[PDB]
Amino acid sequence: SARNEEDESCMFALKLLGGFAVPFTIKAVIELGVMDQLLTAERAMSAEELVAAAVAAQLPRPEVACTMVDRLLRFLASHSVVRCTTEVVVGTDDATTTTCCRRSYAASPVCKWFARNGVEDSVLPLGMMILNKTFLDSWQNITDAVLEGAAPFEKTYGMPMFEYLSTNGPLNTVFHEAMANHSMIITKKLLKFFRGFEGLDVLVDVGGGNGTTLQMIRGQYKNMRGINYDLPHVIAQAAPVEGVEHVGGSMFDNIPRGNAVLLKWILHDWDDKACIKILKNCYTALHVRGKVIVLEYVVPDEPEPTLAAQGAFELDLTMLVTFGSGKERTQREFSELAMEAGFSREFKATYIFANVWALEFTK
Amino acid sequence: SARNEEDESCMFALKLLGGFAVPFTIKAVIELGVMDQLLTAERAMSAEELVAAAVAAQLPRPEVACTMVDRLLRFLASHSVVRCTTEVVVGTDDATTTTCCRRSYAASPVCKWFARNGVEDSVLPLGMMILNKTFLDSWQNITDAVLEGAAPFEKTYGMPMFEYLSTNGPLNTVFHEAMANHSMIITKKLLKFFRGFEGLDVLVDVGGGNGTTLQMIRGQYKNMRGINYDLPHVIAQAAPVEGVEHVGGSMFDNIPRGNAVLLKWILHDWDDKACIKILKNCYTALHVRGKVIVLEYVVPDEPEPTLAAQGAFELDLTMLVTFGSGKERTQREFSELAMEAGFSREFKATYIFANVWALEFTK
Ligand SMILES: NC(=O)c1ccc[n+]([C@@H]2O[C@H](COP(=O)([O-])OP(=O)(O)OC[C@H]3O[C@@H](n4cnc5c(N)ncnc54)[C@H](O)[C@@H]3O)[C@@H](O)[C@H]2O)c1
Ligand SMILES: NC(=O)c1ccc[n+]([C@@H]2O[C@H](COP(=O)([O-])OP(=O)(O)OC[C@H]3O[C@@H](n4cnc5c(N)ncnc54)[C@H](O)[C@@H]3O)[C@@H](O)[C@H]2O)c1
Ligand SMILES: Oc1ccc(/C=C/c2cc(O)cc(O)c2)cc1
Ligand SMILES: Oc1ccc(/C=C/c2cc(O)cc(O)c2)cc1
Ligand SMILES: [Cl-]
Ligand SMILES: [Cl-]
Ligand SMILES: [Cl-]
């Protein structure tokens, strides 16, 4: 009992230190093409069967590849990421790590989110960014960054992340593909569950990229016109989109005038002082009865041990790593920034999807 | 609800991809000195108090340091690693990330396992190895290593781990300190929970280092003599230990004669053929009724979703990453190695601590 408490404590400590193993194993199973074979399978498949289906090339050590994949999948099975069944081996099977016993694996429902197909909703492009080595290396440098009051990313690479992307075309692509993926999913869910675009004549999308988000919204709200507001080098590359003015500039200088401003994953990149500048520009830009629509996660008031709360605090540490002073906020924190920027004590919150809320502040 | 099912599924997918954040956060809290302040505190302490207690040097941006630490500990609290209490701030406090509310933190029981200073009951040296950048970087190269049937470490660094350690003095130290730490903990638990040293006249300790393990065992069993059998260059550096003879040699060539041979975390580094060679050298070194004592994890016959099983399969993946063909084994697998090496069909297993079993095979 006391023996067992000591034992359980030590095992929990080791579990806490080893949490990187699941993500890194999933990454390999995806990259090998094995996850996609699980996703299109009609039945449970052995590691040998999955390797044969995923990998076109002749392998130099095919049995060793098979036994390594078996071990990767066994581990994922113990975490319920895949389903496993075990059958007795008749004869010799060198493609299982256990001579006696052959495992076959099937996808769990969660695995659809790892689809490379793209056809239904997947978060694989976002996951490619989450586990990108460039970004992961920053997490090893938190200590020194904290002692300097700096972003771990900047301590690691010597410049802010957004500048770094200008210097690294491949990472720039990873980052933009991740953002576009998350944006597509959230915009679809917004159109299903959120009613705050009703009645709007003009929506200003800050960071609107090539105008795809506005295009999708305008598709549900045919009367609405859009202002796609983004940096000049972005706006330069945007093709014409029906009903949308592409406008270049900086949101710290000015925001175009409209009936609502959309801020999707913008404010969490910035400290309070910077957020108040943005929101003051929103305030001055809006017409009366106008709204800022903020699409962000919302951290709870206290550190609750729920899946949703842990997710929000994990994004907070991602913002800490990436930006230092970027951060996730509580509902109260968002309201306080809004009030500092001049908005009224009128607050709407609508839950959208995957920890994202739509928060609305009104002039 | 199909909506809520889809939402939970997606959040779960993201949780699975992000599991590295907790280990990296724990590493930073340890490195900063904050964890050791939690361990010695008399009461809950704010991030500001903890940074003041942990960091003697003046910081360039001390308020930013404190808010970052607050965010690291808030995340850990959401994972039950520390306890958190929240009190209303009177005045203005800019060393909490939430200006309304100041959190204070206290160690949970698990935190004692992260203690510095080589203290009683810590796995910190082992943890240093677990989260070492050189060793972690191999986990990014699993896909390509599988395709070649190679160890990820060897794919990453261009040679096996044991060879590479010879060329990297800091990493060699990290490795040996980790092994020594785990050995110390397990040896103390053995002396508490394991019977099998009783009646032994001579115990051979393969990989016995400087003879510390045999020294501890002799502490309890005064009439037992020890042979410390390690690589010649390790033996060269071992100071005399009463009742222990230091002997240099390859365990692949032979093993010194004794009443028992101890193999701790040896077999799991090696494939079946290499294990059978070691155990056959053990068999020749023993007389009838001599024993091999194997200290290893034991993986279950099916991938059970337990804390214990997940820990054993995680070590299996560590072996895959480090050695490729090193692996964790089932009880059946260990029995089948012993019988191949000539041992009798006579098998004892005693659970020790932190997933380690003592398995005994008899000649
Ligand atoms: N970061 C801080 O510590 C902090 C604190 C207070 C205020 N600020 C304000 O933020 C500035 C930092 O930015 P900068 O000087 O490089 O200016 P900038 O206008 O070039 O903006 C830099 C970043 O802002 C974002 N951005 C700007 N306009 C945007 C738009 N229309 N759509 C989408 N994203 C847009 C982009 O991500 C870009 O990389 C400070 O100089 C100050 O004005 C910063
Ligand atoms: N896979 C195998 O069967 C295998 C592997 C390596 C060496 N060997 C044989 O061993 C002989 C010597 O070759 P080598 O010098 O390259 O091997 P070695 O003696 O260096 O042994 C290889 C590894 O075994 C471990 N080791 C060896 N003896 C040990 C001991 N007493 N205590 C703890 N760890 C120990 C070390 O990690 C070492 O790096 C050769 O005959 C070789 O073929 C066989
Ligand atoms: O939780 C844990 C995580 C990792 C480890 C590693 C152990 C280990 C043991 C060896 O003999 C060699 C090695 O290179 C690594 C143990 C426990
Ligand atoms: O589960 C998740 C893990 C990581 C992320 C990262 C989001 C993100 C958002 C930004 O606006 C900028 C950025 O650099 C990163 C989101 C979800
Ligand atoms: Cl092969
Ligand atoms: Cl520009
Ligand atoms: Cl400061």
Coordinates of C-alpha atoms and ligand atoms in Angstrom, one line a residue, chain A residues 149, chain B residues 59-66 94, ligand 7:
Chain A
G149 CA 12.7 37.4 -20.5
Chain B
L59 CA 17.6 39.5 -14.2
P60 CA 17.3 42.0 -17.1
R61 CA 13.5 41.5 -17.3
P62 CA 12.5 40.1 -13.9
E63 CA 8.7 40.7 -14.2
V64 CA 8.6 38.9 -17.6
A65 CA 10.7 36.0 -16.1
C66 CA 8.1 35.7 -13.3
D94 CA 2.7 42.3 -12.9
Ligands
CL7 CL 10.5 43.1 -16.6

